[PDB]
Design a protein around this ligand. Structure first.
Ligand SMILES: Cc1cc2nc3c(=O)[nH]c(=O)nc-3n(C[C@H](O)[C@H](O)[C@H](O)COP(=O)(O)OP(=O)(O)OC[C@H]3O[C@@H](n4cnc5c(N)ncnc54)[C@H](O)[C@@H]3O)c2cc1C
Ligand SMILES: NC(=O)C1=CN([C@@H]2O[C@H](COP(=O)(O)OP(=O)(O)OC[C@H]3O[C@@H](n4cnc5c(N)ncnc54)[C@H](OP(=O)(O)O)[C@@H]3O)[C@@H](O)[C@H]2O)C=CC1
Length: 515
C-alpha cells in the first residue's frame, strides 16, 4: 500500500517524489527501468548531447541552496553534467531509498470499488496505491528507419538513444541517417574524428548557433546573486528560457534594422532566442517568417563555400516548430572528409553487409551507421503500459486517435492518475513546466486528504474544453501548418493562469467522490 506510486525517475519523477513524500508526508514509491536517476539524461549518451536551454535555467528552482551550489561550467549543459546534477539532487534529498530501479511497470489497473490503483511490475510484483503519478517524459520508443536489408549490416549500427560506451571513430567510414536536433549534434561532434562521414539527409532543417561558451566566475556570480529575479522572469514569461520576449513586428522596421536584430541573436546564439527575442510575429505572420528563413539561408550560403552543397543544406519550408541549434554544423560540410546525400532526391533503397545503397545504385561503404531517426510520439509511453481505468478501458483504446487530457495532467476515464510533462501541455522550458505541474498535482492531492475525497477524475467536457483552448491558440500560429492537439501554445505564464483558475474554483471540471 502506498499513497502514491510514481513511474519515472527523471526530472519529473524525482520532484514528484520529493514533493509528495517530504512536503505532503505521503508514503510513496517510484519505479524506473533505468539503473540510476536521470531519465532521458541517463538513456541518451550520444556524442554532442547538449541542453537546448542555458545551464542556469535547465535545473530545479525549488531548492535555493542547490541554486547557490549550482555548477555552471558552460553556457549550456552537456549530458554527463545534467546526469551528475540529477544524481546530486537524489543524494541531497535522500530520494533513492524510495526508488525501485531496474523495474519496468507492465500494467496499472484502477479498482473502482476501493478507488485505488493495482500496479504490476514486469517481474509480477503487485503494488496498490491511491494515486498514480506518471512521469514518463516526452518521447516513446526509439524509431529505427524501415530499410530493406538493415538487418544484414555487419558493421556497428546504433540508434542514438542506445549509444554504447567505448565507441571509437578514428579510421572509420561513418554514416548518419537523420538531421534533426540529435543528428545535428552527432554530426557536428564526430565529423573531425572519422575517416569519412556521409550524412543521409531526408529533409534539411534550419539551424542557428547555440553559442556555447565557458562561464567566467564573474558570469556565474552575477547569475547567482540575481537568481530570485531570474526565476521571477521565468514564471512571468511564455517560454521560460530567460529571453526578452519581443512584441516587435518583423516588418515594422527597415531592412537594415531587421538585419542588425537577427545578427545580434545569431551571435548570442539559441534557437528560441532567434525565433522569439528578435521579433514577436515570426511564428504567426508568413511575411515575417520568410524574413527569418532568408536570414538563415543567407548564413548557410556564406558559411558553406561550395554553392551546390549549400543548396542541398538549404530548406524549402516554414521556419517553424521547435528551433534547432548547433555548435558548428554548417561548417562541417566544408571538410574534405564529409559527403552530404539528399535522400529525398536520391533515396536509400537497400542496406547490405558493408554499405548503404542509394537509388542511383551507389554503394556507400560504411564501418558504422548511426540512426538519429527519432522516437515515437509522446502518447506511446502511455500506450506501451497496460493502463486500464473506468469500465476497464485501456489508454491504447481511449487515445486511439491521439492524446487528449484536461490541463495536460488528467485523462477522462482514468481517475486518481496524474501526468507530469504529459501530452497537451505547454511549449516552454521543461523544468519550470514539471515544477508547475508537480506543485499543482500535489496541492490537489493535499486538498483531497483534507476533504476526505478518494477519487478524482476529469470530465469528458473539461477535456474537450481543453482541446478547444489549445486548438484555438495553435490555429493563430504557423505551427498549426508547417511540419486532438498535442501542445498548449499560450505560454508558461498563461498555462499557470489557466490551472490556477481551476484550483481556485474548487477544481472545476473534476469529479470529486467522497467517502
Ligand atoms: C539532449 C537533450 C537535450 C534536451 N534539452 C532540453 C532543454 O533545454 N529544455 C527542455 O525543456 N527540454 C529539453 N529536453 C527534453 C527532455 O526530455 C526534458 O527536458 C526532460 O529531461 C524530461 O524529463 P522527464 O522526467 O519528464 O522524462 P524522462 O527524462 O524521459 O524520464 C522518463 C522516465 O520514465 C521511465 N519509464 C517510462 N515508462 C516506464 C515504465 N513502464 N516503467 C518504468 N519506467 C518507465 C523511463 O525509463 C525514463 O527514465 C532535452 C532532451 C535531450 C535528449
Ligand atoms: N536532441 C536535443 O537536443 C533535443 C531534442 N528534443 C526533441 O527530441 C525529439 C527527437 O529529436 P531527433 O532525435 O532529432 O528525432 P527527429 O524525429 O526530430 O529527427 C528525425 C530525423 O531522422 C530523419 N528520418 C526518420 N526516419 C527516416 C528514414 N526512414 N529515412 C531517412 N531519414 C529518416 C528525419 O527526417 P524527416 O525530417 O524527413 O522525417 C529527421 O531528420 C525532437 O522532437 C526534438 O525536438 C527536445 C529538446 C532538445
Amino acid at each position: 500500500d502506498f499513497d502514491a506510486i510514481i513511474i519515472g525517475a527523471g526530472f519529473g519523477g524525482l520532484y514528484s517524489l520529493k514533493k509528495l513524500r517530504d512536503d505532503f508526508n505521503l508514503k510513496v514509491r517510484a519505479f524506473d527501468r533505468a539503473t540510476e536517476v536521470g531519465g532521458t539524461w541517463f538513456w541518451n549518451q550520444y556524442p554532442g548531447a547538449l541542453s537546448d536551454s542555458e545551464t542556469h535555467l535547465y535545473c530545479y528552482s525549488w531548492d535555493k541552496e542547490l541554486l547557490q551550489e549550482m555548477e555552471i561550467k558552460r553556457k549550456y549543459i552537456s549530458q554527463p553534467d545534467v546526469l551528475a546534477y540529477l544524481k546530486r539532487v537524489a543524494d541531497k534529498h535522500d530520494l533513492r531509498k524510495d526508488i525501485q530501479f531496474e523495474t519496468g511497470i507492465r500494467s496499472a489497473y484502477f479498482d473502482e470499488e476501493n478507488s485505488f490503483w493495482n500496479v504490476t511490475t514486469e517481474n509480477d510484483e503487485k503494488f496498490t496505491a491511491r494515486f498514480l503519478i506518471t512521469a514518463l517524459g516526452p518521447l516513446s520508443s526509439p524509431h529505427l528507419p524501415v530499410i530493406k536489408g538493415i538487418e544484414t549490416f555487419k558493421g556497428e549500427l546504433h540508434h542514438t538513444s542506445r549509444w554504447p560506451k567505448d565507441v571509437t571513430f578514428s579510421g572509420k567510414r561513418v554514416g548518419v541517417i537523420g538531421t534533426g536536433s540529435t543528428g545535428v549534434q552527432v554530426i557536428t561532434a564526430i565529423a573531425s574524428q572519422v575517416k569519412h562521414l556521409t550524412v543521409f539527409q531526408r529533409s534539411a532543417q534550419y539551424s542557428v548557433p547555440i553559442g556555447n561558451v565557458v562561464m567566467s566566475e564573474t558570469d556565474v556570480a552575477k547569475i547567482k546573486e540575481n537568481y530570485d529575479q531570474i526565476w521571477e522572469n521565468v514564471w512571468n514569461s511564455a517560454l521560460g528560457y530567460g529571453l526578452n520576449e519581443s512584441t516587435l513586428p518583423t516588418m515594422s522596421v527597415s531592412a537594415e534594422e531587421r538585419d542588425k536584430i537577427f545578427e545580434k541573436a545569431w551571435q548570442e546564439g539559441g534557437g528560441f532566442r532567434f525565433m522569439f527575442e528578435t521579433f514577436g510575429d515570426i511564428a504567426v505572420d508568413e511575411t515575417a517568417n520568410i524574413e527569418a528563413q532568408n536570414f538563415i539561408k543567407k548564413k548557410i550560403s556564406e558559411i558553406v563555400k561550395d554553392p551546390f552543397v549549400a543548396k542541398k543544406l538549404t530548406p524549402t519550408d516554414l521556419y517553424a516548430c521547435r528551433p534547432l541549434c548547433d555548435s558548428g554544423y554548417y561548417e562541417i560540410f566544408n571538410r574534405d572528409n564529409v559527403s552530404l546525400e539528399d535522400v529525398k532526391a536520391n533515396p536509400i533503397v537497400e542496406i547490405k553487409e558493408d554499405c548503404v545503397v542509394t537509388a542511383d545504385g551507389v554503394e556507400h561503404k560504411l564501418d558504422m551507421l548511426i540512426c538519429a531517426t527519432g522516437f515515437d510520439a509522446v502518447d506511446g509511453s502511455y500506450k506501451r503500459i497496460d493502463i486500464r481505468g473506468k469500465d476497464g478501458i485501456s489508454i491504447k483504446d481511449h487515445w486511439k486517435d491521439g492524446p487528449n487530457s484536461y490541463l495536460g495532467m488528467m485523462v477522462s476515464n482514468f481517475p486518481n492518475m496524474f501526468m507530469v510533462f504529459g501530452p497537451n501541455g505547454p511549449l516552454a522550458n521543461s523544468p519550470p513546466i514539471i515544477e508547475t505541474q508537480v506543485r499543482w498535482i500535489a496541492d490537489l492531492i493535499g486538498y483531497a486528504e483534507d476533504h476526505q475525497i478518494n477519487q478524482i477524475e476529469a470530465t469528458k467536457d473539461a477535456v474537450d474544453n481543453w482541446t478547444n483552448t489549445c486548438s484555438d491558440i495553435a490555429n493563430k500560429t504557423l505551427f498549426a501548418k508547417a511540419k486532438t492537439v498535442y501542445l498548449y501554445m499560450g505560454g508558461l505564464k498563461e498555462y499557470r493562469n489557466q490551472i490556477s483558475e481551476v484550483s481556485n474554483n474548487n477544481y472545476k471540471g473534476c469529479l470529486l467522490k467522497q467517502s
